[PDB]
Design a protein around this ligand. Structure first.
Ligand code: MG
Ligand code: MG
Length: 248
């Protein structure tokens, strides 16, 4: 049923705005939108500079349980660990609940597996010390090949990713059911489904597509696995489509 999958998907959304024209007022509006008439999203995802006003806004409307996710090393996934760590420490100091860091995928495409491992591990150590979850964006659209998607997923998991996420939403190709299945198969094959969640992101716009992404999760790990600690939708306009499927 689409309605059951849509409500489920809504409660798993990282409701996102990551735009050149973002403003405090736009993030405040996103916070109000996260408190939907059928329930709250799992989180918002915003640039780090909007975290403090977002936290205040979420608290004052009585939804402090809507988590605050942000992005670092974003969107480029450069291989400078000092910079990626510095942005991650800034995100923490701002008040992030979760940091979505971009894996250095161009370095991996060049044959360097080590910098990706160290970059994820450095950011994880900072986040873990602050009780902040770390998601790792591997950019499946640029990786393109299934072997590289598996490898970037494997490196991120071994380096301590709490989530692996398909995409930044800033490149030509983002989440696809094919890329989602590959990444979830890595979680399954590595036996880390209890400690590593999955997050399709970018281009996920319809309730029909959200249903397909959850179906893959249900198929691989059972219908009870995809909770907020283990599954998120990185999306924006998807919320309107999920609500329309629900009667709002
Ligand atoms: Mg470099
Ligand atoms: Mg070393």
């Amino acid at each position: 049923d689409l309605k059951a999958s849509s409500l489920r998907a809504l409660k798993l959304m990282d409701l996102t705005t990551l735009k050149d024209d973002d403003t405090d007022e736009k993030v405040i509006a996103l916070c109000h939108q996260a408190k939907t008439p059928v329930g709250n999203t799992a989180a918002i995802c915003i640039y780090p500079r909007f975290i403090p006003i977002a936290r205040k806004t979420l608290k004052e409307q009585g939804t402090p349980e809507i988590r605050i996710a942000t992005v670092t090393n974003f969107p480029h996934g450069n291989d400078d660990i000092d910079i990626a760590l510095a942005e991650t420490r800034a995100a923490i100091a701002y008040g992030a609940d979760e940091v979505d860091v971009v894996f250095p995928y161009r370095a991996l495409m060049a044959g360097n597996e080590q910098v990706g491992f160290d970059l994820v591990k450095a950011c994880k150590e900072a986040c873990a010390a602050a009780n902040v979850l770390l998601k790792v964006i591997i950019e499946t659209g640029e990786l393109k090949d299934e072997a590289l998607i598996r490898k970037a997923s494997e490196i991120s998991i071994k380096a301590g990713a709490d989530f692996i996420k398909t995409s930044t939403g800033k490149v030509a190709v983002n989440a696809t059911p094919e890329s989602a299945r590959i990444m979830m198969e890595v979680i399954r094959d590595m036996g880390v489904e209890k400690t590593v969640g999955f997050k399709p992101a970018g281009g996920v716009r319809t309730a029909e597509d959200a249903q397909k992404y959850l179906a893959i999760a249900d198929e691989l790990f059972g219908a009870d696995w995809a909770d907020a600690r283990h599954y998120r939708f990185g999306a924006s306009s998807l919320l309107a489509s999920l609500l329309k499927a629900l009667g709002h």
